[PDB]
UniProtKB/Swiss-Prot annotation, chains A, B:
Keywords recorded for this protein, A-Z: Antibiotic, Antimicrobial, Disulfide bond, Immunity, Innate immunity, Secreted, Signal
Organism: Camelus dromedarius (Dromedary)
Protein name: Peptidoglycan recognition protein 1
Domain of life, per lineage: Eukaryota
Quaternary structure note: Homotetramer.
Compartments, as annotated in UniProt: Secreted; Cytoplasmic granule
A Gene Ontology molecular function term of the record: peptidoglycan immune receptor activity
GO cellular component terms listed in the entry, alphabetical order: extracellular region
Family: Belongs to the N-acetylmuramoyl-L-alanine amidase 2 family.
Keyword Signal: yes
SS bond partners: C1-C125, C17-C62, C38-C44
Biological function: Innate immunity protein that plays several important functions in antimicrobial and antitumor defense systems. Acts as a pattern receptor that binds to murein peptidoglycans (PGN) of Gram-positive bacteria and thus provides bactericidal activity. Forms an equimolar complex with heat shock protein HSPA1A and induces programmed cell death through apoptosis and necroptosis in tumor cell lines by activating the TNFR1 receptor on the target cell membrane. In addition, acts in complex with the Ca(2+)-binding protein S100A4 as a chemoattractant able to induce lymphocyte movement.
Example of a GO biological process term: negative regulation of cytokine production
Length: 166, 166
């Protein structure tokens, strides 16, 4: 189920991450990268590389912090994926959640409909696979940490999701 | 599901087609447009418009002939959809099959992995909502009509799909 740009196709550095998540997962945390937006497969693969680069090389994480990334190209970029604990929401939320990040800054722009679809589609895929609970809950990054993430314009949107829980 | 770009989002003219498909549908025919290629959402939306516009204004059809279109942006473009008989494989095949078209000429080029993924994902999303049959059969366009569609290279690939039938 789902179309996902695999690690190898956005030319990801090999993962060093080992800590597994306990399936099915109850919580999804939605962030923004607060970085550059991109609207083409070519530019969005490059941006996935840039986010992973910042996390592995500068913050010294085992991989890109996010389980999945969303491009404005309307594609899902594989991060740690469904089975591996992420680094996106702190030490209380990272063990019990999937972290999906919209590549961009959504303080003043909304992500386009294709990106919102790609994200909702991904989560349904999670349920279908048994990676997420049928009764999964969606959180803002700001609901679980002191942050503007995932941006006012995007936060306002995810609040209207059927699985949103403050 | 399956993260399909809706009619309205690619600035489609309204359909005037009435003839429903008898679901669950048994066949999938795979064509190329033999038209211009596109690899950005902006360009691929303009290309679906261009194909629809030819079918409607020039050939006088009720809508774009294809049930679905596949861009090299890795997105699926809603044509006539799951429920409306197409105009893509001729009258033997139009009322019993779903038509999906790769936007481009694939005689001497291959479509990218994300276009092929998008296609496969679309088919599983058909099964899933009951539009296609669990055990559907994929046919080449050149396998049901005197045409080179869907191109030498793309025809070689669909040949190796699990569900492919010669
Ligand atoms: Cl017609």
């Amino acid at each position: 189920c789902g179309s996902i740009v695999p690690r190898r196709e956005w030319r990801a550095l090999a993962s060093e991450c080992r800590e597994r998540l306990t399936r099915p997962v109850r919580y999804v945390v939605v962030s923004h990268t607060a970085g550059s937006h991109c609207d083409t497969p070519a530019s969005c693969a490059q941006q996935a590389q840039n986010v992973q680069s910042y996390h592995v090389r500068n913050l010294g994480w085992c991989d890109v912090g996010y389980n999945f990334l969303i491009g404005e190209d309307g594609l899902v970029y594989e991060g740690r994926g469904w089975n591996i604990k992420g680094a996106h929401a702190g030490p209380t939320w990272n063990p019990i959640s999937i972290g999906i990040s919209f590549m961009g800054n959504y303080m003043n722009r909304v992500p386009p409909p294709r990106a919102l679809r790609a994200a909702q589609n991904l989560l349904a895929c999670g349920v279908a696979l048994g990676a997420l609970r049928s009764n999964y809950e969606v959180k803002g990054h700001r609901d679980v940490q002191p942050t503007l993430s995932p941006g006012d314009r995007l936060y306002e949107i995810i609040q209207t999701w059927s699985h949103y829980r403050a």
